[PDB]
Design a protein around this ligand. Sequence first.
Ligand SMILES: Nc1ncnc2c1ncn2[C@@H]1O[C@H](COP(=O)(O)OP(=O)(O)O)[C@@H](O)[C@H]1O
Ligand SMILES: [Mn+2]
Length: 428
Amino acid sequence: KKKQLTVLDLHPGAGKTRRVLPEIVREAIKKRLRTVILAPTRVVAAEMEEALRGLPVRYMTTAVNVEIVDLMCHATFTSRLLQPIRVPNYNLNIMDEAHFTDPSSIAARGYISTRVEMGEAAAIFMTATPPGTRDAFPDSNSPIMDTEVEVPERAWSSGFDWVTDHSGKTVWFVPSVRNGNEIAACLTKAGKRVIQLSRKTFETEFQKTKNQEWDFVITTDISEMGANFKADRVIDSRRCLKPVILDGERVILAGPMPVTHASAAQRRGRIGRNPNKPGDEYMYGGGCAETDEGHAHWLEARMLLDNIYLQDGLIASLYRPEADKVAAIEGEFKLRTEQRKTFVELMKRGDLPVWLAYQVASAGITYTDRRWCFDGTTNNTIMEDSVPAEVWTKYGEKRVLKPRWMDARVCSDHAALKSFKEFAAGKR
Ligand SMILES: Nc1ncnc2c1ncn2[C@@H]1O[C@H](COP(=O)(O)OP(=O)(O)O)[C@@H](O)[C@H]1O
Ligand SMILES: [Mn+2]
């Protein structure tokens, strides 16, 4: 029904995606409701075509090889809202894995919930862990053995025999890509077969969990968003890096620090999913805390939402239960037409973090002008192998990487640094 936002918060594995979602879609088709289904990732979008097989759904992603029901990724929806492209005023908005804390997912939730509040649409947010969840140990299809235990975050030689004595398969949530690299190298030296997953490698590398033999999957928090494993153990550091905007001028990666209860419940929720296989184990290495408070993703969500047309001059609010996570003045990030296009291109083609893309576009810099990558303060020098990183500019001059605005996420691992060096050199 219109003006209704429903939170479908069945416990993990209860069947929200494979049982309830197809029933909702069939009903929406019957009622001739223009409907959008929002999948967190391309991998999950492919899994949804399997669950929705038969039904007339337009899949707006090349991730599926195959209507009044559209399916697209969370980020695609928000990106299309930001661009001149026409987006239907969907009568029914279904967000699967609606706990995703990516800035584009938060922004989408704010847009959708505002259209519902205005009485223009209906929405269903599907997630075991709605915003504000305080339960890290929800129900599961089969019982879980929960154990609080010290979990290594560096290479080890002794004192953690329980890690390597296990003969099943383990999903291990690490605080960072670099921390996961070190743990992976340690496990590999101990004779284990390890697959590593992160945000930017997920679609490629996740397939290895089906196609290869493995003993451990080392993953950051991307695997909290519908990623399905045939494991019988989760090792959870219970730690994450928190992007924080410091003194309004830079972004640091603070911590590692506790994950939220929702994140911990989602990580544990990778196991206990088979009602016929009890005895899955969850080993956790710390407590939870509300570390989404002040987390840059919710500031970045407001930067996105301030630039989405809703109606005349109105600006969509964040979804009420997560609106308190950021201190921001509504509309303070609204950009005019040309600066907004630069903003969008810096985020898409530029592959820059939202906060950084905003600093560049709001300064009046055009997308291809990379002088700002070199004219920052000395304290903004980016290091590679303990020496200042250097690139050849598009002019042919070798220069130290020293961006005017420093966002730790452009150089937090080797791959991110490689990408930002390519950006500073004008190569995309
Ligand atoms: N490809 C598959 N074939 C059979 N069962 C599956 C498949 N994928 C998931 N399942 C199982 O179906 C049940 C419901 O899954 P799902 O709808 O994803 O749960 P939820 O979305 O509520 O977390 C779970 O036990 C899950 O382990
Ligand atoms: Mn689901």
